[PDB]
Design a protein around this nucleic acid. Structure first.
Lengths: 150, 100, 206
RNA sequence: ACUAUGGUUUUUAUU
RNA sequence: GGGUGAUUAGCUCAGCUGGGAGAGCACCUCCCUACAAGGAGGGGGUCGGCGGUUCGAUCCCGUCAUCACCCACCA
RNA sequence: GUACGGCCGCAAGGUUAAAACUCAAAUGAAUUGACGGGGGCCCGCACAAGCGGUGGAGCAUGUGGUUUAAUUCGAUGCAACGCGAAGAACCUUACCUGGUCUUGACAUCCACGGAAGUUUUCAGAGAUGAGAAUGUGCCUUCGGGAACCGUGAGACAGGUGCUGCAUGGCUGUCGUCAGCUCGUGUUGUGAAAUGUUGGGUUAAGUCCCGCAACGAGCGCAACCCUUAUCCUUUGUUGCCAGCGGUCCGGCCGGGAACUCAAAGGAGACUGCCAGUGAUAAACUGGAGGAAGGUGGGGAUGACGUCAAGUCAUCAUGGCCCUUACGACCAGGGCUACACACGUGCUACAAUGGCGCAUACAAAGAGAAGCGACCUCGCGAGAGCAAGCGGACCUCAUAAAGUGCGUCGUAGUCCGGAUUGGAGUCUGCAACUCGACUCCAUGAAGUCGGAAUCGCUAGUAAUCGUGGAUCAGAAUGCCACGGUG
């Protein structure tokens, strides 16, 4: 009923001491294998530098900021039938959701090479069209109607 | 109990050790030939393979204290139920139940 | 829950075994078959000798066999020749020479093995069941126990119904690892029912 | 959102 | 005076190959539970009777009885 | 408060007001349970946030019910259904059929003939039923026996048959939940209350405070076991920094530094300080250090448990059979599906597969055993044979991972089931229904539909290693490690 449990900082990256990259490999990890993420890491940014990649000071941290989650909800109750309410997420959650939104948008249809399917999504992460934006507005049209009686 | 299951054991595992725990050489002689496409043995195989009351097969050891076919432990001579019974009474050396 | 003896579940707590020896990996189970045979023989020959336990040590290429008895004078005879015929047979079923060590139990009414026999005595003549356990409690606390628990189950009355009775005095304490608790369960073999008897006794930590 | 009804019988108790 | 349907199990009734006795509720009894519901196996027949046909008639023809139903029965 | 008659009313009615018939309890009062679609309030991987799944496909695999000559017997409220009863040709077997003998497979006392045994032929599915040879041992108050193989008595023997509505024992589980007993006092007509209720606060009757309740027990907590860092003691079949020699091999001298294997000391007490708060107790935060805040974790199970399971782990009251609900054999059934429900594991891919090389163990097991080396061959297998009693050999080039070629969305020339051919072995013997190998063969299948799981850390997720059971064969049952 209070969770809130422990404290877990995790480790930074071994080559530049990055905190965001060492977390992003924990999103591309599947079957407990991090090697498959290290085939996609830096190669997506270097493949963006074959199409549109200008400046690399933040690598992909601003693509993860042009990607913008806003439509998260929770359920409120006093018994049986429940009432939906929207929530104002913390930057640590906003970032954790943006990291899934973009790699799930790059996985939407089957093609070759995830570094290249992600570079196509990062070249879109300056104007943000279709995937990771068109579902957001279709549920945001209730975002004040679900505040009315608190 | 069914004491007929021990009457099987007495003429199987308790009598096989001197006659059936090594016996496969006594049939392999019928595969000992001087040349291919040639016979010297014919149907004598059915006399070398004549025993039926004793076999290398059908041999169950059973628990030596309960006659039970499942849950025996060869290293103690006891079953799953008697390992606890001897251990709780302290009547078996080297074995303890907790606390590592 | 599961009951079990407080001895072997606490044997990791500086406690001794009832059989202590080391044997070859091709006959350890056959030496443990001998370890059962010597008890199943002696508990039929010494059946009136008030035996509380039989402990097995195997020194000097022999079997020691240590018998804790409240009636040693009918085990050793008059004197030391009646046991020479006994250890001849113990050595036969063991496959090794046999010593025999006879130890006198000072307080049999303090030991859960013989307190159950002292209760079984009064169930032969059917005294009031709720007195029979209180006498066993009184006699044990007067003998230097720091607590005792009893239980008697089935055909205690009076009528055809099956009931249980207990009473408890002093300390147990069953979760205390160092308590070295003395325990027994038995039957009174009555002419209707059987009457089951349980006893737990506490003396002090190790 | 709100959320119908439940067939027959059921301890010895001693001094 | 002429036509038409019925009479089969304690109670209500079905009726496809003519070698056929049956469904549910009642009667008996096992399973599940001690009952009951629910499952399953049994007991008990004037298939209204007689004659004819038929290898055999509840089962088709004919006809006697009793009950229902439309007609005729003084002018 | 219905009937009859009266009385009052325009009237519905109001008022007076029976008897027959009928049952073992109705009711007032205070008290304890238990429930609410009452109130407050504790806490939970019940919700919250994240991810991997189940519910399709193909095989494996568990259960019920009907069925059947067996489809053994049990466990259905939430405590049944990969489970008790570990590897179904015959076996093992409870179940079932056709044979056979009834003092009987199993146990003893007496009589009667035989040594125990060893060999060999016929009848028979075999159990066994008939012959033909062989051996005559032990004790010899010298009596004739013992013992052993059977047979015929009188007592008997047999039963995992049926009953936990007969039980002693065994046991599920609330639940690691914080609660429960034994006594004495007091209040109350007494049942009953108190304390065990309250105020902080914990995993906790915690650790203090306090009221008419105060002691002694069982729990909680502790005991015992295990670990992070320093110091010490000690070193082969373990270790190898320095140094001599070298099958150049920690290999041999040798060292004792360093892993490690291991006993012993130090370290951690909410103890220090701040913030809250009875200048309370207790938490939250800070400091130290390798690191706290039941240290992280084990063994953990107080009372009473459901009109609850187990007589198939063992005894045992009762019922019943023995021309058998035996036992000794040959075969069956346990691998019927007319219908009712689940758990796995593998592919559904590309961020992947396939083929061919390569790095790392951890923990067991191993003298009629683990089996090297080298082979014969397409290969299972078969052949020869060393080391090894296991810190000195063998099982055993761990697989994920690291890499190079290659394949590609075609619903997969992927997945390779499945149907054949050629075999190799195990056993009395592989029709159904046995393993393992080589060459053919060719299929469903884009993580899913109502709906719904487990974990806050070496956990969830994922890929390999070993052992017990052992004629030949586990997708069964338990440990060990990499990635995380």
């Amino acid at each position: 009923r209070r969770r809130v449990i422990g404290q877990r900082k995790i480790l930074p990256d071994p080559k530049f001491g990055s905190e965001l990259l060492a977390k992003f490999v924990n999103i591309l990890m599947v079957d407990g294998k991090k090697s498959t993420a290290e085939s996609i890491v830096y190669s997506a940014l270097e493949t963006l530098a074959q199409r549109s990649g200008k400046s690399e000071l933040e690598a992909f941290e601003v693509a993860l900021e042009n990607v913008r989650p806003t439509v998260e909800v929770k359920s409120r109750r006093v018994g049986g039938s429940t009432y939906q309410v929207p929530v104002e997420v913390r930057p640590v959650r906003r970032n954790a959701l943006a990291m899934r939104w973009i790699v799930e948008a790059a996985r939407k249809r089957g093609d070759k090479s995830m570094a290249l399917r992600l570079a196509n999504e990062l070249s879109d992460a300056a104007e943000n069209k279709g995937t990771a934006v068109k579902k957001r507005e279709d549920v945001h049209r209730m975002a004040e109607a679900n505040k009315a009686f608190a | 109990a069914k004491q007929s299951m021990k009457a099987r054991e007495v003429k199987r595992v308790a009598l096989a050790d001197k006659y059936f725990a090594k016996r496969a050489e006594l049939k392999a002689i019928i595969s000992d030939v001087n040349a291919s496409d040639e016979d010297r043995w014919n149907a004598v195989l059915k006399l070398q393979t004549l025993p039926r009351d004793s076999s290398p097969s059908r041999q169950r050891n059973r628990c030596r204290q309960t006659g039970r076919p499942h849950g025996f432990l060869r290293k103690f001579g006891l079953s799953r139920i008697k390992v606890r019974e001897a251990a709780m009474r302290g009547e078996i050396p080297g074995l303890k139940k907790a606390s590592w | 829950g599961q009951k079990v003896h407080p001895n072997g579940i606490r044997l990791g707590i500086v406690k001794p075994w009832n059989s202590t020896w080391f044997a070859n990996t091709k006959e350890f189970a056959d030496n443990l078959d001998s370890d059962f045979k010597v008890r199943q023989y002696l508990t039929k020959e010494l059946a009136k000798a008030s035996v509380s336990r039989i402990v097995i040590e195997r020194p000097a290429k022999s079997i020691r066999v240590t018998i804790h008895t409240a009636r040693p004078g009918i085990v050793i005879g008059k004197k030391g020749e009646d046991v020479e015929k006994l250890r001849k047979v113990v050595a036969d079923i063991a496959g090794v020479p046999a010593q025999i060590n006879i130890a006198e139990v000072r307080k049999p009414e303090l030991d859960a093995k013989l307190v159950a026999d002292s209760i079984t005595s009064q169930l032969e003549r059917r005294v009031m069941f709720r007195r029979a356990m209180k006498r066993a409690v009184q006699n044990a606390m007067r003998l230097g126990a720091k607590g005792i628990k009893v239980e008697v189950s089935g055909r205690l009355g009076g009528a055809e119904i099956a009931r249980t009775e207990w009473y408890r005095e002093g300390r147990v304490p069953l979760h205390t690892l160092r308590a070295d608790i003395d325990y027994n369960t038995s039957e009174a073999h009555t002419t209707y029912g059987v009457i089951g008897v349980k006893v737990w006794i506490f003396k002090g930590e190790i």
